[PDB]
């Protein structure tokens, strides 16, 4: 309240080719008390992963929006953050993935919510997509693991649209990190962290 801050930091794509050429474009929105803030410097940082940012700091335009692009030559996951001076900590965007287009690779992992009740019933749903040649791959085995709770299954085969899904419940509270992988791709794909509460 009464502080300029990044309220949203999103990308136009969940994945791109690991050719160092295709760009993922991020948009940071900056508001104070819900009102767009113009001419505010937004600092961008690669929190984790291997990639290159086009800029490290850009000012918002007259709509309160500042953009930056990301490219990479390495298959993997990348987390980029955005911050304004008054924020205590940067806002992380959802991870994105750079893929070898010639190989069936996970291109996204999404959780339908980031919190749930720790009663063994309230389930968080994770959805992974697998693609090759920018097309979805069917019947690819995606294997899931977790640091907390019970997954509905360990391995699910992608459907005709490239998607595999599992649910996660927990009878005890805490943060949970779900990971996913496919064969022959050397990327430990991490889902957004979630948290269960009693
Ligand atoms: Cl996402
Ligand atoms: Cl459990
Ligand atoms: Mg989509
Ligand atoms: Mg693309
Ligand atoms: Mg439910």
Author numbering: 555 to 752
Quote from the publication.
Intimin is classified as an inverse autotransporter, a subclass of the type 5 secretion system that transports the C-terminal extracellular region or passenger through the lumen of the N-terminal β-barrel located in the outer membrane. The intimin passenger forms a rod-like extension consisting of four tandem bacterial immunoglobulin-like (Big) domains (subdomains D00–D0–D1–D2) capped by a C-terminal C-type lectin-like domain (D3).
By contrast, the crystal structure of D0–D1 exhibits a kink between the two subdomains, leading to an approximately 45° angle between the two and a distance between the N- and C-termini of only 36 Å. Here, we show that D0 and D1 exhibit a seven-stranded strand-switched type (s-type) fold. EOM analysis of D0–D1 revealed the presence of two conformational states, a bent and an elongated conformation. Based on this definition, the crystal structures of D00–D0 and D0–D1 have θ ~ 170° and θ ~ 60°, respectively. Figure 4a shows that D00–D0 adopts extended conformations characterized by a narrow, approximately bell-shaped distribution of θ centered around 140° whereas D0–D1 is considerably more flexible and explores a wider range of domain-domain angles, including the strongly bent conformations. The best crystals of D0–D1 were obtained in 0.1 M tris, pH 8.5; 0.2 M magnesium chloride hexahydrate and 25% polyethylene glycol 3350 (PEG3350). The flexibility demonstrated by the D0–D1 and D1–D2 connectors is also likely to be functionally important.
